[PDB]
């Protein structure tokens, strides 16, 4: 009677700000067990030395003081152990956020002809996390650039694209890069932009300068595609899917340069086309969108308890767009490559088992405990039935299923005589006893013996035999016209000790007699101790058919059928 | 805009205690209507005078002062009238509870031989409500007789039956009758009972003296059956069904002399047998239990509004164990004999209609209002579609459904020319227009005119015709082995204004492309403006079959199929 280690908290991927006020980085790991568990940690698939005046432990959590990329960056995972086995936590990656300021060198001036679009390169500084948000400031820091059809800011390159340049756009433009992971924002030095005036602005055809390449995205994620063009007449951008309908969860946005898809499905895979139009010309661009899916469990493993010597199959099934591979760990070490199947299970197999399902994109863990039971045969839970009722000429099966672990051997003895396999007497291996073509000499006391490696068990039962239930008078077929009265006769013989009932069925279907419609034309008039007749009034065409009377008792049932024809 | 009278509160059967403290009896009747209703009352199928001083009116409720059996007891019902018709309330019976005290005459003494059962007659006084409860007192009023297997108290006759008489039974016995309806209790004069002692008492066989006759009871009601026998050895009573199982909601009780059935079903109909046993002999008694069911609505009528000249069918359906008869009243007077059906409805038919469903046991009312509408044809709610899309050689139907009462006449005009019934052009009577084998000359502006007895209406619409979508290159049948790559080709021609899609189906079922299983072997590949091919990888036996490519657009769809054979 114990409790294996179960993971409550597992470490997650973490990024530590380089300039954080706190000098400590903590990874969380916590587990439950009946004997208090022991926690261990591993770094880059290698053991981590304890003490050293750097690492510290806080109830299973690993704390590092003044971490340096040259020392701590990498993969950590946690191990929870006890007297019943070990369990491994999900691998967690620890990295450090990096973001330097822009170079303080002055930016050169840029002159642009009015009516000609231009591109401004942000050239962001060095950074470790690539989840950067880009904006642009005008003249002063508090000022920001509004998103229009002429002005576009790429979220990948970080550049600023102006389709049409006018005198109103003149001024100093600076880039602004923010990282939310490290919460650090920096702006570049301002670039003066001067538009040379023109009296006869020249039109330019639409040219797509911001394109979106082939993108692999996961199911359920939010995906954004960018497409932008330049030209003297403000170009219009339209999105469409190739010979297919656009996904329902699609937002073109007001600007028309960004396409957002929420909770992408497997159907959305294919080509997407962005078309830019103006008065002078037009352009088209096609891109590939591939859809993938993280591994998701179908039948995850649960704490299981099995008997000794019994073959065991654990169903571990996961589904993903790329067929995921299945792995099996035992106490934190590789054990199986998929479809774990055990034979002649013993105490050695018991422990903690972990099924991993991993594709090329993600991996999911499932933890469980396998316990082994060793028990002597006992009939306390499912004892033998005191009285069993049987009839002559009918096969009878007596169940003797005890609670035993190693699947013990079964024997049957008729009180003072031992039974063996015979023609009409059969002992199948599940423990029950079969008797065919029964006679009154068969009734008596039967004892079921179960012999096991650990102990033996004996159970007693009594079987009594009664006369079979048969039908003396069967119903006679009849033919009548519409609107006449019909009578169906049924009389049965049974054992007085047993209770007999009569059930009428029409064309293979039992009549319920609980609906008002059936009572109109059908009535049951059971009389005497064995007479069970049926009356039909105001017969109709649909009433004609097969009527079967069944005498039913607790041991067997006997049926006799007849036909009723209705003419007009 | 009017509103007919609708009943909120209806009078119920009432019993008034003869010696009540309050001297007024009130019957409640309430209805709502847009013109405030007028209330009338009827007594014993006859009008009741409003000015009698005894009677008074309180907001539609009828109050009676100092009611007397000879004058006021009987059947009352309420009538709610207005400018739109009359409605009748459910008939309510008003009766007066009656219970006089016992006669003060002394009761003679009764001597009984020990070992012989006896019967004590209550002789209850006159009473109007028959829901009497019987008990018995010994010597003093607070003392009561407990019900045992020897002592039984009938709830119908009210007598006390003693199966075995002993010396302890001597004493004075008085009957006690209570009525819950009037909450009145009275006890009779005491009867002295003296048992003559006997030595070596001889046993007597069991004789059933309390029997239960054939009983008709309604579905869902509570049924009680009484059976009791007498004899020197205290007899045991058992209840059973002849050739069927006893109802689940059956309680035999501790005494064994009363059988209780709760929420009786239609199945409980049949014979019930009571068996009394002792040492000397036994006895059996059979009785018939018949089950009935009150009328219950299936599709009761509701306030309905219909147009003029339209045939009307009123569905009024009720179900009961005895087939209920259906009657139709109009404004409180007989109108129809069942299944009311009206043709060429006019203003005269509008009013208040009452469907009654009554069997031999109960009756159910259903009140409703039938309104008739006369309206000029209008296209405000369902105007003509501004733009209609069609294809060459394809049949097209243009819907012109106005809101008009007498089903007006319809005409169609191509702007300046009137259309008539033709070979390819047919104008059916519902108002829509059908065109077959359409050509480019057919496209244009069509006007639907609706001429009615009351006014006319004109609606305008524009129908544009486009080229049909067909398949230039059809898929080619292919035969391959398992594990091979197959390509199915499909190319279509369509009108550039319309948007075209491609749908692939396998063996008459469209492929969803939303399940991970389909993506394993199927890859849909679309290119250009008309190329839509499909790729099958790692073919299996189950993949072989019929593949159909369907080019689908807003106007029509064109399909082409092919076959794929798999070997190996
Ligand atoms: C034939 O006999 C049966 C059985 O006696 C009657 O049916 C019972 O009627 C009583 C009331 O007359 C019901 O009791 C009520 O139960 C309500 C809750 O119903 C649920 O819970 C009960 C008990 O577990 C279930 O049986 C039932 O199916 C439901 O699941 C309570 O809310 C009621 O309380 C209110 O009314 C009582 C009335 O005395 C007040 O005292 C309370 O203060 C409160 O206002 C009430 O207790 C009972 O549930 C019904 N069924 C059964 C099986 O007992 C038939 O009415 C009766 N028919 C005829 C024609 O005689
Ligand atoms: C221009 O051309 C159009 C198209 O042919 C005509 O529209 C037809 O109008 C006639 C009436 O003049 C319609 O005939 C009637 O149709 C009724 C509805 O039929 C449907 O429902 C029945 C129900 O059983 C179906 O069996 C049937 O297949 C339909 O689905 C019928 O109920 C009518 O039956 C009888 O009614 C009277 C009653 O006395 C008899 O006198 C009749 O002779 C008839 O036996 C009747 O058949 C016809 O249905 C309309 N066409 C279509 C396609 O529905 C226009 O009338 C014609 N002229 C003008 C000016 O528009
Ligand atoms: C956008 O970038 C442009 C870059 O060209 C920038 O233009 C410069 O602005 C400064 C600030 O106004 C200018 O410097 C001034 O020039 C005027 C005209 O010559 C002088 O009168 C000013 O003198 C005052 O300030 C001096 C500061 O030392 C004092 O010493 C003096 O006593 C006066 O108080 C001042 O020198 C500069 O000429 C322009 N142009 C260039 C090429 O630098 C612009 O300001 C930026 N911001 C915008 C446009 O919002
Ligand atoms: C007395 O008679 C009974 C009644 O037959 C007998 O019980 C039988 O035992 C045999 C031996 O195991 C059972 O046969 C097996 O049953 C299991 C469960 O269904 C099957 O999985 C087995 O299939 C394998 O074995 C076959 C060869 O037996 C192979 O050909 C097959 O390809 C499989 O590899 C096998 O069929 C049999 O089912 C029972 N009978 C039952 C359950 O009704 C008993 O052994 C006899 N002797 C005694 C009691 O001393
Ligand atoms: C993708 O965006 C949707 C936006 O709806 C996210 O769904 C939730 O939307 C509600 C809107 O009120 C937000 O309050 C929630 O915070 C959103 N998230 C969740 C988990 O509920 C969705 O989560 C986004 N998915 C990703 C992967 O970013
Ligand atoms: C078929 O039997 C039924 C049931 O008896 C007959 O219906 C009624 O039966 C009662 C029996 O007491 C008679 O009093 C009625 O006169 C019978 N008729 C009706 C209409 O209720 C039924 O009549 C019998 N069949 C025929 C063809 O008469
Ligand atoms: C059928 O075509 C598919 C698609 O071209 C082939 O898939 C290849 O799969 C392997 C393993 O994932 C990739 O490395 C290859 O790149 C895929 N092919 C191409 C062209 O990229 C598949 O092998 C083909 N099978 C047969 C029997 O021809
Ligand atoms: C394990 O328990 C979960 C609890 O919801 C259940 O969904 C799952 O089916 C169980 N495992 C198996 C193999 O049934
Ligand atoms: C059956 O087992 C019980 C133990 O529970 C034992 O007392 C009894 O003697 C056994 N019967 C035999 C061996 O016949
Ligand atoms: C019954 O009444 C009689 C008549 O007065 C009396 O003699 C006798 O004692 C009474 N019995 C009991 C038990 O009080
Ligand atoms: C009639 O109205 C009642 C409610 O008043 C509703 O329960 C019933 O379903 C309605 N039946 C029809 C046919 O509209
Ligand atoms: C349609 O009817 C309206 C009034 O009902 C009228 O003003 C209009 O001129 C009519 N149009 C045609 C085309 O008859």
Author numbering:
A (entry chain B), B (entry chain A): 37 to 604
Text taken from the publication that reported this structure:
Cell-surface expressed contactin 1 and neurofascin 155 control wiring of the nervous system and interact across cells to form and maintain paranodal myelin-axon junctions. Defining subfamily features are extracellular six N-terminal immunoglobulin-like domains (Ig), four fibronectin type III domains (FnIII) and posttranslational modifications, i.e., N-glycosylation at multiple sites and a C-terminal glycophosphatidylinositol (GPI)-membrane anchor. All four members are type I transmembrane proteins with six extracellular N-terminal Ig like domains, three to five FnIII domains, various predicted N-glycosylation sites, a single transmembrane spanning helix, and a ∼120 cytoplasmic region with a highly conserved ankyrin binding sequence.
Contactin 1 Ig1–Ig4 horseshoe segment resembles previously reported contactin 1, 2, 4 and 5 segments. Contactin 1 forms a larger-order zipper in the crystal that is also formed in solution and the neurofascin 155 binding site is exposed in this oligomer. The zipper arrangement emerges from four interfaces, denoted α to δ, that capture four separate dimeric arrangements of constituting chains. The dimer burying most surface area buries 2980 Å2 and does so using twice the interface α where Ig3–Ig4 on one molecule contact Ig6 of the other molecule. The second dimeric arrangement involves interface β burying 1190 Å2 through Ig3–Ig3 interactions between chain A and a symmetry related chain B. In interface γ, Ig3 of chain A contacts Ig5–Ig6 of a symmetry related equivalent molecule, whereas interface δ forms by Ig6–Ig6 interactions between chain B and a symmetry related chain A. Addition of a contactin 1 molecule to a dimer formed through interface α to form a trimer, contributes two additional interaction interfaces, e.g., β and γ. Contactin 1 may however form cis interactions, and the zipper is compatible with cis-interactions as the c-termini, that connect to the cell surface, are all on the same side. While contactin 1 and neurofascin 155 interact in a mode similar as to neurofascin30 and contactin 222 homodimerization, in the structure we report contactin 1 does not form homodimers via the Ig1–Ig2 interface.
